[PDB]
Amino acid sequence: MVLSEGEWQLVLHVWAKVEADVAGHGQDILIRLFKSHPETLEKFDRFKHLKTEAEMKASEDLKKQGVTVLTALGAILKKKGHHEAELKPLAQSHATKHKIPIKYLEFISEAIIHVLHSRHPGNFGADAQGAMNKALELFRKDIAAKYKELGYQG
Numbered sequence: 037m038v039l040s041e042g043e044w045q046l047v048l049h050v051w052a053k054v055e056a057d058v059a060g061h062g063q064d065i066l067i068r069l070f071k072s073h074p075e076t077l078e079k080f081d082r083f084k085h086l087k088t089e090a091e092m093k094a095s096e097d098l099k100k101q102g103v104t105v106l107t108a109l110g111a112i113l114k115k116k117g118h119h120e121a122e123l124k125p126l127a128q129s130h131a132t133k134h135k136i137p138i139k140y141l142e143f144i145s146e147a148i149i150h151v152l153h154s155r156h157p158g159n160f161g162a163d164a165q166g167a168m169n170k171a172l173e174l175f176r177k178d179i180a181a182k183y184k185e186l187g188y189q190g
C-alpha cells in the first residue's frame with residue numbers, strides 16, 4: 037500500500053498537535069491499551085505489577101515508555117513510507133527480544149486512534165482518521181513482513 041501526499045498531510049497535521057505534549061499522549065495511549073487489552077501489560081517486566089489506572093498514571097516508568105513509543109512512531113510517520121531503516125531495529129527487538137505478536141500492534145493502533153479522536157476532534161474527522169488508519173496499517177504490514185524475514189510470527 038501507498039498513501040497519497042494528501043493522506044500524509046492529514047496524518048502529519050494531527051501528529052504536530054500530538055507533539056505539543058508527547059508524554060501526556062504517551063500515557064493516555066498506553067493506559068488505553070492496558071485497560072482495553074490487559075494481557076499486553078504482562079509484556080512489560082518493569083510495570084506488570086500495576087493494578088489500577090491511578091497506579092498507571094503515577095508511574096514514571098510508564099510515562100517514559102509512552103515517550104519512547106511515540107518518539108519512535110513519529111520518526112517513522114515523518115518518513116512518509118520510506119521507513120525501511122527505522123523498521124529494522126524495531127522489528128528485531130519486538131520480534132526476538134520482547135516477542136510482540138502483530139495482534140498487539142493492532143491493539144495499540146486502536147488505542148492511538150481512540151486517544152487522537154478524544155483529544156483532537158477538530159483535526160481528526162473521518163478523512164483524517166482514514167489516513168491515520170492507513171498509515172498504521174502500512175506500518176503493521178511492513179513490520180509483519182520483517183517479522184517473517186527474522187523468523188518470527190507474521
Ligand code: HEM
Binds near residue numbers: 109129141144
Ligand atoms: C507503535 C508500535 C510500537 C513502537 C513504535 C514501539 C517502540 C519501542 C521502542 C522504541 C522501544 C525501546 C527500544 C526497543 O526495545 O526496541 C520499545 C521497547 C519495548 N516495547 Fe515497544 N513499541 C511498539 C509496540 C509495542 C507493544 C504493542 C508492546 C507490548 C504489548 C511493546 C513492548 C515493548 C517492550 C516490552 C519493550 C521493552 C520495555 C523495557 O525496557 O523493558 N511494544 N518499544
